[PDB]
Amino acid sequence: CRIHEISCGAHSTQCIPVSWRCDGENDCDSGEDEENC
């Protein structure tokens, strides 16, 4: 994806910007961003 984007795991193709991570909301399909933060 884009340099300023990260995928919600290798098993999913959904990409979210870097600021989306650890914002306190389950942005990904099952909240992978908040996992291990």
Binding site: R2, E5, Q14, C15, I16, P17, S19, W20
Partner: protein, 49 residues
């Protein structure tokens, strides 16, 4: 910046009051996720976010 095409607006409920007694929803088609700066161009209503 994500591009927005074919956006429509409908209002679920509205009640004129000092509080934010009114909620609207927007439907759209985009290509990548992200954030946008949302604004209301008239003073007859004022948004919150």
């Amino acid at each position: 910046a994500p591009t927005i095409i074919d956006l429509t607006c409908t209002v679920a409920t509205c009640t004129h009051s000092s509080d934010f007694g009114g909620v609207l929803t927007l439907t759209y088609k985009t290509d990548k996720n992200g954030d946008c700066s949302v604004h209301s161009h008239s003073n007859v209503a004022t948004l919150q976010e």
